[PDB]
């Protein structure tokens, strides 16, 4: 039966294809090998257990060597592969990171688009993924990107929902929460941060970077602005401060100034996250290090560059022998990279067509993790040939909103506006016109659903968009009614005809429909996450042999022997051998 | 009749495909043609070319040194597509953009646009004349230095040439429009650079003598290439007459911390200006470039965004953006840089057949040290031999081979030797120990034997004795400069040879071509006779011909524009011929070509 | 069973690779109804000619045919019919199934021609089935009708002449196997070469029907060699030799209506014996000669069921009967049952699309070449083989030219192949009868081993051909009598078991062909039990088949899936046999 359920998924996929793969490129027909005895060395995880989050923050500050966060298991594939990287490929390498690179600060491996996408697109539980990484790497900190008032979603939630979620995340194994607000609005962060401290985990409050601190003609976003935000987040009870350069806009000179000034403004350690879209982010990371930054993010070489993080192996190599040398073995970095390379090939279906660095990022400000996405939508809305006008629209739409931080979800809101401008052939001057008579997302933002910029929203655009609906300027969750968690849990148990887990109730609070659809498919198809990635996406070619582990003990030998023509009722029969026993699995012909 | 030959080319490719493109990915069927950007319309401003002519090469070098701003060289027209598109970039696309560079970016130091692999690949794979290319660039950008890579003892070839031949080619190159010669020897052997350096100066042109970078000056476990190895060479090259010293970091090995130290030291060891070339394979070469700039380097190379990154140069627009407003701000408009880059992106889309499968940065570069321009090629060569799933063993054997040869500068042509050694080691399952084993017969590759014999010159500490003795199978090696053993070419006699083969007089340029590439040039000349001036065709037509019904505009001369329509194509006849039915300017033309399937 | 296993192996081997005889030929309409055996009226079978022959014996039975007023009928559908139209590929499955229906619906029939000729050879070599088994099955289906074979005389059932004791031995077996009526012919109308066979048929107490092969034209004075006296002498001659019945074997369909009125008056006046007439309808007028024969008082005639009649076959049974219906010689055969059986043969025919010729209809050309109905199409594909399709009418002129060269001879198996081989070559090399007078194996072998023509062979032609002394003695006398006890041990040592008497007869006739068949029997089992589509095309994907492995055991075989070709060359067919999953590996021969 465990086996039966899987065999049926392997029949369906073999006969019909995966919807996400069926007409995108296929992988080069001509497998990843986990690298090849000791126990594991205590690391940052044992240290955090010893010191607690406050003192641990202090230990980072005092530490001479730069500390490294590896973003491969989250941001890396979120930016390069539409976030389609699977638990199977992520879980299998954790033990290797654990044994081979025990000096790492943390693995960024959760939150961001992974929660959503893992269920909705990859038919797998994100809590299962977290647990398996926890078991693989008991000596490293596990880091998530947490979207402040948004959790792992796009709408701002009731306070208790946010509270509940952070509680279960901590229980699932998150040690380090990188929390951010899409308008750098500290008031909208106080709920999540307090929730993190109350779990006794690391609250790394982030400041999103935009504009250019060294351009006097763009004064909205200068030095003071960042340094004051820092001082505000310390008072707010942060253990660490992050600079989140979501679009890779921080230039090297700017880093040199920024990180001096930040460390003078606060005693807290500083953590720097950036993207390589410009093709010089590594210069900025090195600059940051030279100015004394406490911790930096990079991605394994094979999933680095462009819209991802800059190259981990190269940055480490740049520092090796220096006062701030991180002490990571370059030969082990390569071995793990060669693995991710072999992993990456399996996702040929999800490669963008981005060929290299673009200094154009300084014009549009699209976040690394939005870039490809917004090119896909433009191709979808038929605008492929006009893509550069869309970049111009983004920036123009950005000025219109009064020059704002564009990170999730405010970035979609700008995206949505820019596409409408190019489509409906509209200028900003038309957009503002009091007479030239808006995406749901835009109206949402302009009322006050995602908070307030420093500016305040431009009054003329606002009164035009809202047309009737008076705006609110209070903090969103201070209007949302406190979800009846008791009463909202029943609804998902009479819809699934069973008790769920606290973790499951969490997935549901965040994504009612996506979790629902996931639970049904899961009762149909079984533990599909244990299937290797080429089997998950393409089934089993004829005569072929597959090993899957359904639990701790049992390994299954699954062989596709044969696949019949289609019968009278529209069915197709796949003939299997499961551990030497003959199996026939009928699967409906969806052609 | 030049129309007839062009139609014959179009028919052949229409019916049979182009051998270089037939079995590779095709461009998107949509495909916006590249649009030359509209320019404001103000004149061309005097730039570095006028200054060179005024000052002569020596004082101009001085001018570079004294300039506070950092000087940029754009590599897009040469190293850019050598590294990323197998050098297949065509004259049509290269020359169409020169005027834009000229009007828009007048402050550039030079366009690197000639030499390296372009000389050979233009004739061999593109059926076009590298001198014609240079002439069109010269005419479009009369205010900028035109720059070439010149291989010192190998000219634009791969083998050693007689002195008089190296001297002759350099004279033609100067005449053809080259202003700035980056000249390098693959073993950093100054003795072997002297003839070239002297020839460049005798032409009153810029001699930018290069030091190749390898290893790590900051790693005291690798002392052979320490700081003083570079500063000694810079002093030696100056004595030898350089106007400019280049650091040629062919594999992108130089790290930022090392650049801080190297460029400060160089500019103290010599008064000449310094020019820094690197490659972005590591994914951090821009950090090294900005650090070089911080440290006072005079010029740096970059490639236009759309042809930069990975094995190419680091991104030009972003480098420029990061200097914007600094003390050494290079004075280049990034709007215009982005416009020229957008053109290059459309141009590059046409070359889908030649894209590699490289995904991004690789710190593995610090291990293998493969030059950026070799990487993709070597990997194709490995695939060729069934070694695709063992690429990383090839990269490891390449490192091991480097050490076995005594740890050497790896760049054309010495890099190809190490590559040959590596491929053989992986195929035949041989460790370095096996390679030098007394009990193991090993047929060494020809490039390896030749190198240990002396043909490529002398590394600073000689060739490892036991390896050499084993590889040479009794042949006696030499330590003189390989050119001093070559017979002076009988220039008069040889010119007569090619003139009798082609039954016509050739120009001096054509003759230099022949001197460097006798077979490839002859072949090219025979193709020109049959097909006419195919370089005037747009790139899709050149690689794919015309689809059924398709209308193409083409300029056979500056005078007229031919309108060509593919009206119909016949079945293969009993002669094995296919008839293409063209309209040329409303008139019917039936062209017959062979069915080559 | 392992017999079941063997059938699956075959079914898999044909499903994956096709039948070699069918794979590159036309395929039955994808529509196609299963032929349906008609439910015949009642319970028992009316005694018929079989019971009469049991009671009376052969001589007296001959007298009874003579005396009978009604015309008697032989149905040739089971033998000559598909030999002429379908290259003798008709299967036992289809033949056996209909026997009982004949037995109930047409008890008045004289005989079923159903054995002999090319069937013996072709059933084994091309159909992978036992001709004796086939005979037994018809015997069981029709215990009231006579069963008739064609016997090539001294050639027996092969193409060469055999030892006397082999001919004797084979005929003994044919009797024990169920044949009641033997039609014996010599390919040169040579009675001395017939004497052994007839004696042997008499000795086994079955009907000796001694045939006289018709050729030329008794009514054309310009061709006197085969005049009326020629035949009437041969009729009187064979009566001395002990015929129970005299046949006129018109192998080429050359006898014309006016010639029939004369020939049959004269014959019945020459001999007391009944006369049986066999013809072929290549002219498109043979029915006319049949009806002329009846009116002149012939005792028995041959016809083929409507659906396998006309052209190179026999003339139409149903139409001949309908024409005699109500006349004083009315054969007493239900026209509606003939049509029911015809509808059946029509559905059976459609299954053999692979073997249809492109013969369009009647050809008066037959009077020029004289090619036997059974040869015509054969020799035309053969001419095709050698790129002569375009010069086919020249190949016909060549055959008639060749015939005159040999001296205007009786052309029929195996003398006909001999003229065939000659004319083919003659065209290939562009050679006149003047040129001819380096040969094919069989042209020199006849001039030496087929027997003697009434005048002898042409002098110069025999000399320039044989290049070695010729003989005139009966071939069966110069062939030392085969050691029968020795020869048996040989086929039994090779086949690692003793064979039955019938099987030793097969081996004696066709040593190589029987040997290969036995081996195939051991490998594929009783394939003859499969229905015809299955035997030639296997089972479609998901097709359900019902097959009778034996008596009252039906197997339910379903082909459920067919795997890709595996690394070690094999292919795996996934059967369900009687609800039980089964896996059969066969090699991809392609
Ligand atoms: Cl949902
Ligand atoms: Cl050459
Ligand atoms: Cl035989
Ligand atoms: Mg620190
Ligand atoms: Mg300077
Ligand atoms: Mg009668
Ligand atoms: Zn990010
Ligand atoms: Zn280079
Ligand atoms: Zn017949």
Short mmCIF file of N, CA, C and O in Angstrom, two decimals, chain B residues 55-137:
data_model
loop_
_atom_site.label_atom_id
_atom_site.label_comp_id
_atom_site.label_asym_id
_atom_site.label_seq_id
_atom_site.Cartn_x
_atom_site.Cartn_y
_atom_site.Cartn_z
N UNK B 55 51.39 62.60 -30.37
CA UNK B 55 52.45 62.44 -29.38
C UNK B 55 53.49 61.35 -29.68
O UNK B 55 54.55 61.33 -29.08
N UNK B 56 53.15 60.41 -30.56
CA UNK B 56 53.94 59.21 -30.78
C UNK B 56 53.79 58.26 -29.61
O UNK B 56 53.38 58.67 -28.51
N UNK B 57 54.17 57.00 -29.80
CA UNK B 57 53.86 56.00 -28.73
C UNK B 57 54.46 56.26 -27.35
O UNK B 57 53.81 55.98 -26.35
N UNK B 58 55.68 56.78 -27.27
CA UNK B 58 56.36 56.98 -25.98
C UNK B 58 55.64 58.05 -25.15
O UNK B 58 55.22 57.79 -24.03
N UNK B 59 55.45 59.24 -25.71
CA UNK B 59 54.80 60.31 -24.93
C UNK B 59 53.35 59.95 -24.61
O UNK B 59 52.82 60.40 -23.61
N UNK B 60 52.73 59.11 -25.42
CA UNK B 60 51.34 58.72 -25.21
C UNK B 60 51.24 57.80 -23.99
O UNK B 60 50.33 57.94 -23.18
N UNK B 61 52.16 56.83 -23.89
CA UNK B 61 52.32 56.04 -22.68
C UNK B 61 52.45 56.94 -21.46
O UNK B 61 51.80 56.70 -20.43
N UNK B 62 53.26 57.99 -21.58
CA UNK B 62 53.40 58.96 -20.51
C UNK B 62 52.07 59.61 -20.19
O UNK B 62 51.68 59.67 -19.03
N UNK B 63 51.34 60.03 -21.22
CA UNK B 63 50.01 60.60 -21.04
C UNK B 63 49.04 59.66 -20.25
O UNK B 63 48.25 60.13 -19.42
N UNK B 64 49.13 58.35 -20.48
CA UNK B 64 48.29 57.36 -19.79
C UNK B 64 48.61 57.33 -18.31
O UNK B 64 47.70 57.23 -17.46
N UNK B 65 49.90 57.37 -18.02
CA UNK B 65 50.39 57.27 -16.66
C UNK B 65 49.86 58.47 -15.86
O UNK B 65 49.29 58.32 -14.79
N UNK B 66 50.03 59.65 -16.43
CA UNK B 66 49.61 60.90 -15.80
C UNK B 66 48.10 61.10 -15.73
O UNK B 66 47.63 61.96 -15.01
N UNK B 67 47.33 60.33 -16.47
CA UNK B 67 45.89 60.51 -16.41
C UNK B 67 45.34 60.01 -15.05
O UNK B 67 45.68 58.91 -14.58
N UNK B 68 44.55 60.86 -14.38
CA UNK B 68 43.96 60.50 -13.09
C UNK B 68 42.81 59.46 -13.24
O UNK B 68 42.75 58.45 -12.50
N UNK B 69 41.92 59.70 -14.20
CA UNK B 69 40.86 58.76 -14.54
C UNK B 69 41.45 57.42 -14.94
O UNK B 69 42.57 57.37 -15.46
N UNK B 70 40.72 56.34 -14.68
CA UNK B 70 41.12 55.04 -15.19
C UNK B 70 40.69 54.93 -16.65
O UNK B 70 39.61 55.39 -17.03
N UNK B 71 41.54 54.32 -17.48
CA UNK B 71 41.20 54.18 -18.90
C UNK B 71 40.59 52.82 -19.13
O UNK B 71 41.01 51.85 -18.51
N UNK B 72 39.55 52.78 -19.96
CA UNK B 72 38.90 51.52 -20.33
C UNK B 72 39.20 51.07 -21.73
O UNK B 72 39.20 51.87 -22.66
N UNK B 73 39.43 49.77 -21.85
CA UNK B 73 39.42 49.04 -23.11
C UNK B 73 38.19 48.11 -23.11
O UNK B 73 37.98 47.35 -22.15
N UNK B 74 37.38 48.21 -24.18
CA UNK B 74 36.23 47.33 -24.46
C UNK B 74 36.72 46.11 -25.27
O UNK B 74 37.29 46.25 -26.38
N UNK B 75 36.51 44.93 -24.71
CA UNK B 75 36.94 43.69 -25.34
C UNK B 75 35.89 42.93 -26.17
O UNK B 75 36.20 41.87 -26.78
N UNK B 76 34.66 43.47 -26.20
CA UNK B 76 33.51 42.80 -26.79
C UNK B 76 33.78 42.28 -28.22
O UNK B 76 33.32 41.19 -28.59
N UNK B 77 34.54 43.05 -29.00
CA UNK B 77 34.69 42.75 -30.40
C UNK B 77 35.75 41.68 -30.63
O UNK B 77 35.96 41.29 -31.77
N UNK B 78 36.43 41.23 -29.57
CA UNK B 78 37.42 40.16 -29.70
C UNK B 78 37.28 39.14 -28.55
O UNK B 78 36.57 38.16 -28.74
N UNK B 79 37.90 39.36 -27.39
CA UNK B 79 37.95 38.34 -26.29
C UNK B 79 36.54 37.90 -25.86
O UNK B 79 36.29 36.69 -25.67
N UNK B 80 35.62 38.89 -25.73
CA UNK B 80 34.21 38.63 -25.45
C UNK B 80 33.61 37.45 -26.21
O UNK B 80 33.17 36.47 -25.59
N UNK B 81 33.67 37.47 -27.54
CA UNK B 81 33.00 36.42 -28.27
C UNK B 81 33.96 35.24 -28.52
O UNK B 81 33.52 34.14 -28.78
N UNK B 82 35.27 35.46 -28.39
CA UNK B 82 36.20 34.35 -28.38
C UNK B 82 35.88 33.46 -27.19
O UNK B 82 35.91 32.21 -27.30
N UNK B 83 35.59 34.08 -26.04
CA UNK B 83 35.39 33.26 -24.87
C UNK B 83 34.02 32.63 -24.76
O UNK B 83 33.88 31.62 -24.09
N UNK B 84 32.99 33.22 -25.39
CA UNK B 84 31.62 32.87 -25.09
C UNK B 84 30.92 32.29 -26.30
O UNK B 84 29.98 31.52 -26.13
N UNK B 85 31.33 32.69 -27.52
CA UNK B 85 30.70 32.19 -28.77
C UNK B 85 31.69 31.54 -29.75
O UNK B 85 31.46 31.59 -30.96
N UNK B 86 32.78 30.96 -29.25
CA UNK B 86 33.80 30.31 -30.10
C UNK B 86 34.32 31.19 -31.23
O UNK B 86 34.75 30.71 -32.27
N UNK B 87 34.26 32.49 -31.01
CA UNK B 87 34.82 33.50 -31.89
C UNK B 87 34.04 33.63 -33.16
O UNK B 87 34.55 34.17 -34.15
N UNK B 88 32.80 33.15 -33.16
CA UNK B 88 32.08 33.10 -34.42
C UNK B 88 31.45 34.42 -34.82
O UNK B 88 30.85 34.52 -35.89
N UNK B 89 31.58 35.44 -33.97
CA UNK B 89 31.00 36.75 -34.24
C UNK B 89 31.45 37.37 -35.58
O UNK B 89 32.65 37.52 -35.82
N UNK B 90 30.49 37.80 -36.39
CA UNK B 90 30.78 38.25 -37.75
C UNK B 90 31.00 39.72 -37.96
O UNK B 90 30.47 40.57 -37.22
N UNK B 91 31.74 40.02 -39.04
CA UNK B 91 32.04 41.37 -39.46
C UNK B 91 30.80 42.25 -39.59
O UNK B 91 30.81 43.41 -39.21
N UNK B 92 29.72 41.68 -40.14
CA UNK B 92 28.47 42.39 -40.35
C UNK B 92 28.04 43.06 -39.05
O UNK B 92 27.73 44.26 -39.06
N UNK B 93 28.06 42.29 -37.95
CA UNK B 93 27.58 42.76 -36.66
C UNK B 93 28.62 43.62 -35.93
O UNK B 93 28.26 44.62 -35.27
N UNK B 94 29.89 43.26 -36.08
CA UNK B 94 30.99 44.02 -35.46
C UNK B 94 31.11 45.43 -36.04
O UNK B 94 31.05 46.40 -35.30
N UNK B 95 31.23 45.53 -37.37
CA UNK B 95 31.38 46.79 -38.04
C UNK B 95 30.16 47.70 -37.97
O UNK B 95 30.29 48.92 -37.97
N UNK B 96 28.96 47.15 -37.95
CA UNK B 96 27.75 47.98 -37.91
C UNK B 96 27.68 48.87 -36.66
O UNK B 96 26.93 49.83 -36.64
N UNK B 97 28.44 48.51 -35.61
CA UNK B 97 28.37 49.20 -34.33
C UNK B 97 29.55 50.14 -34.09
O UNK B 97 29.46 51.02 -33.24
N UNK B 98 30.64 50.01 -34.85
CA UNK B 98 31.80 50.89 -34.61
C UNK B 98 31.49 52.40 -34.51
O UNK B 98 32.03 53.06 -33.63
N UNK B 99 30.65 52.93 -35.40
CA UNK B 99 30.30 54.35 -35.44
C UNK B 99 29.61 54.83 -34.17
O UNK B 99 29.87 55.95 -33.66
N UNK B 100 28.75 53.98 -33.63
CA UNK B 100 28.12 54.22 -32.34
C UNK B 100 29.16 54.38 -31.22
O UNK B 100 29.13 55.39 -30.47
N UNK B 101 30.08 53.42 -31.09
CA UNK B 101 31.15 53.53 -30.08
C UNK B 101 31.85 54.87 -30.23
O UNK B 101 32.05 55.62 -29.28
N UNK B 102 32.16 55.19 -31.48
CA UNK B 102 32.82 56.41 -31.85
C UNK B 102 32.08 57.70 -31.40
O UNK B 102 32.71 58.60 -30.83
N UNK B 103 30.78 57.79 -31.67
CA UNK B 103 29.99 58.97 -31.28
C UNK B 103 29.68 59.00 -29.78
O UNK B 103 29.75 60.06 -29.17
N UNK B 104 29.35 57.84 -29.21
CA UNK B 104 28.79 57.73 -27.87
C UNK B 104 29.81 57.63 -26.74
O UNK B 104 29.60 58.20 -25.66
N UNK B 105 30.90 56.91 -26.96
CA UNK B 105 31.86 56.67 -25.90
C UNK B 105 33.23 57.21 -26.30
O UNK B 105 34.19 56.47 -26.26
N UNK B 106 33.33 58.50 -26.66
CA UNK B 106 34.63 58.99 -27.18
C UNK B 106 35.85 58.86 -26.23
O UNK B 106 36.99 58.90 -26.69
N UNK B 107 35.59 58.70 -24.93
CA UNK B 107 36.66 58.60 -23.95
C UNK B 107 37.35 57.23 -23.85
O UNK B 107 38.28 57.08 -23.07
N UNK B 108 36.90 56.24 -24.61
CA UNK B 108 37.50 54.91 -24.49
C UNK B 108 39.01 54.92 -24.80
O UNK B 108 39.47 55.67 -25.63
N UNK B 109 39.78 54.08 -24.13
CA UNK B 109 41.17 53.95 -24.56
C UNK B 109 41.27 53.27 -25.95
O UNK B 109 41.89 53.81 -26.85
N UNK B 110 40.66 52.10 -26.10
CA UNK B 110 40.79 51.32 -27.31
C UNK B 110 39.63 50.36 -27.38
O UNK B 110 39.03 50.04 -26.35
N UNK B 111 39.29 49.94 -28.61
CA UNK B 111 38.53 48.71 -28.87
C UNK B 111 39.49 47.56 -29.07
O UNK B 111 40.30 47.60 -29.99
N UNK B 112 39.43 46.53 -28.21
CA UNK B 112 40.17 45.31 -28.55
C UNK B 112 39.28 44.65 -29.58
O UNK B 112 38.13 44.27 -29.27
N UNK B 113 39.78 44.52 -30.80
CA UNK B 113 38.94 44.06 -31.90
C UNK B 113 39.67 43.18 -32.92
O UNK B 113 39.12 42.95 -33.99
N UNK B 114 40.88 42.71 -32.63
CA UNK B 114 41.65 41.99 -33.68
C UNK B 114 42.66 41.05 -33.05
O UNK B 114 42.91 41.14 -31.84
N UNK B 115 43.25 40.15 -33.85
CA UNK B 115 44.12 39.10 -33.32
C UNK B 115 43.37 38.07 -32.46
O UNK B 115 42.14 37.89 -32.61
N UNK B 116 44.10 37.43 -31.53
CA UNK B 116 43.66 36.21 -30.86
C UNK B 116 43.19 35.24 -31.92
O UNK B 116 43.85 35.09 -32.95
N UNK B 117 42.03 34.63 -31.70
CA UNK B 117 41.52 33.56 -32.56
C UNK B 117 40.78 34.12 -33.78
O UNK B 117 40.46 33.38 -34.70
N UNK B 118 40.55 35.43 -33.81
CA UNK B 118 39.69 36.06 -34.83
C UNK B 118 40.30 35.95 -36.20
O UNK B 118 39.58 35.86 -37.18
N UNK B 119 41.62 35.95 -36.26
CA UNK B 119 42.31 35.99 -37.55
C UNK B 119 42.06 34.70 -38.31
O UNK B 119 41.75 34.70 -39.49
N UNK B 120 42.14 33.60 -37.61
CA UNK B 120 42.06 32.27 -38.21
C UNK B 120 40.56 31.86 -38.41
O UNK B 120 40.15 31.39 -39.49
N UNK B 121 39.73 32.12 -37.39
CA UNK B 121 38.34 31.68 -37.39
C UNK B 121 37.49 32.44 -38.44
O UNK B 121 36.62 31.84 -39.13
N UNK B 122 37.78 33.73 -38.62
CA UNK B 122 37.15 34.52 -39.68
C UNK B 122 37.26 33.88 -41.06
O UNK B 122 36.28 33.81 -41.79
N UNK B 123 38.44 33.41 -41.43
CA UNK B 123 38.60 32.76 -42.72
C UNK B 123 38.04 31.33 -42.69
O UNK B 123 37.32 30.90 -43.60
N UNK B 124 38.40 30.60 -41.64
CA UNK B 124 38.15 29.19 -41.56
C UNK B 124 36.66 28.88 -41.39
O UNK B 124 36.12 28.02 -42.07
N UNK B 125 35.99 29.58 -40.49
CA UNK B 125 34.61 29.21 -40.14
C UNK B 125 33.62 30.26 -40.59
O UNK B 125 32.47 29.95 -40.78
N UNK B 126 34.06 31.49 -40.78
CA UNK B 126 33.13 32.54 -41.23
C UNK B 126 33.22 32.95 -42.72
O UNK B 126 32.37 33.72 -43.21
N UNK B 127 34.23 32.44 -43.44
CA UNK B 127 34.42 32.75 -44.87
C UNK B 127 34.56 34.26 -45.10
O UNK B 127 34.01 34.78 -46.08
N UNK B 128 35.28 34.96 -44.22
CA UNK B 128 35.45 36.39 -44.39
C UNK B 128 36.83 36.85 -44.03
O UNK B 128 37.55 36.13 -43.34
N UNK B 129 37.19 38.06 -44.47
CA UNK B 129 38.58 38.51 -44.49
C UNK B 129 38.82 39.31 -43.24
O UNK B 129 38.14 40.31 -43.02
N UNK B 130 39.81 38.90 -42.43
CA UNK B 130 40.05 39.66 -41.23
C UNK B 130 40.56 41.09 -41.50
O UNK B 130 40.29 41.97 -40.68
N UNK B 131 41.26 41.34 -42.61
CA UNK B 131 41.70 42.71 -42.98
C UNK B 131 40.52 43.61 -43.36
O UNK B 131 40.49 44.78 -42.96
N UNK B 132 39.54 43.05 -44.08
CA UNK B 132 38.31 43.79 -44.40
C UNK B 132 37.62 44.24 -43.09
O UNK B 132 37.23 45.41 -42.93
N UNK B 133 37.53 43.31 -42.14
CA UNK B 133 36.98 43.61 -40.84
C UNK B 133 37.67 44.79 -40.14
O UNK B 133 37.03 45.79 -39.75
N UNK B 134 38.98 44.67 -39.96
CA UNK B 134 39.77 45.76 -39.42
C UNK B 134 39.54 47.08 -40.19
O UNK B 134 39.43 48.14 -39.58
N UNK B 135 39.50 47.04 -41.51
CA UNK B 135 39.30 48.27 -42.26
C UNK B 135 37.95 48.95 -41.95
O UNK B 135 37.90 50.20 -41.79
N UNK B 136 36.87 48.15 -41.86
CA UNK B 136 35.52 48.67 -41.53
C UNK B 136 35.47 49.27 -40.09
O UNK B 136 34.86 50.34 -39.86
N UNK B 137 36.15 48.61 -39.14
CA UNK B 137 36.27 49.17 -37.79
C UNK B 137 37.04 50.50 -37.85
O UNK B 137 36.55 51.52 -37.36
#
